[PDB]
Design a protein around this ligand. Structure first.
Ligand SMILES: CO[C@H]1OC[C@@H](S[C@@H]2OC[C@@H](S[C@@H]3OC[C@@H](S)[C@H](O)[C@H]3O)[C@H](O)[C@H]2O)[C@H](O)[C@H]1O
Length: 191
């Protein structure tokens, strides 16, 4: 089950979302259980992974990953909420670009053996799950990169809410790999 374009659905009990601007080279493959593999290069812009839809406030995610990025890429729990429309990330690892660069810091949270700095950014009239919109992005960036473990979402959501970052009704929630003008490979297994 190799994807040929942006796509969503459920595979082996896991929701999957793959978004690509169609550029560069990329092969996103759905695999057994909560696993997926992706190999990419060139000048593409994409993000995809497996998880759940809808996400929940208290989900405890367990994942493993063989992550090998080259350039701007992220390995992170990724999801959205509506009313308010929010795109969020729990960045476990990343490449050459720290997504919080120049972002407004909103404190930090210690969870699952790691420490994460919290940030908020804004996207103006950009693609979203509701079409072209202007929305906030919430980030939890681990101070030390890792590619596997447990992520207790309640600790991230509550840290954000307490810092004044409101969350809406949950849309999808996945363990994603993302890249922008980067290259590399990754095999991620959720659960
Ligand atoms: C830097 O981030 C880059 O990768 C991630 C995307 S976000 C992307 O936005 C589109 C939605 S799918 C969307 O749903 C609504 C209907 S109306 C529309 O036709 C669909 O395309 C994806 O789930 C989400 O991952 C950034 O845009 C991009 O810059």
């Amino acid at each position: 089950q190799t994807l040929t374009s942006s796509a969503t659905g459920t595979h082996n009990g896991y929701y999957y979302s793959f978004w690509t601007d169609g550029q560069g080279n990329i092969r996103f493959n759905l695999e057994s259980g909560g696993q997926y593999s992706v190999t990419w290069s060139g000048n593409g812009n994409w993000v995809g992974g497996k998880g759940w839809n809808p996400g929940t406030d208290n989900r405890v995610i367990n994942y493993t990953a063989d992550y090998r990025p080259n350039g701007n890429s992220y390995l992170a729990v990724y999801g959205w909420t509506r009313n308010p429309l929010i795109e969020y990330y729990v960045v476990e690892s990343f490449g050459t670009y720290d997504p919080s660069t120049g972002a407004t810091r909103m404190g930090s949270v210690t969870t699952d053996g790691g420490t994460y700095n919290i940030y908020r950014t804004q996207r103006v009239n950009a693609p979203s799950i509701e079409g072209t919109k202007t929305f906030y992005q919430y980030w939890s960036v681990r101070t030390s990169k890792r590619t596997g473990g447990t992520v207790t979402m309640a600790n991230h959501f509550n840290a954000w809410r307490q810092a004044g970052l409101q969350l809406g009704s949950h849309d999808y929630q996945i363990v994603a790999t993302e890249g922008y003008y980067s290259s590399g490979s990754a095999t991620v297994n959720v659960g």
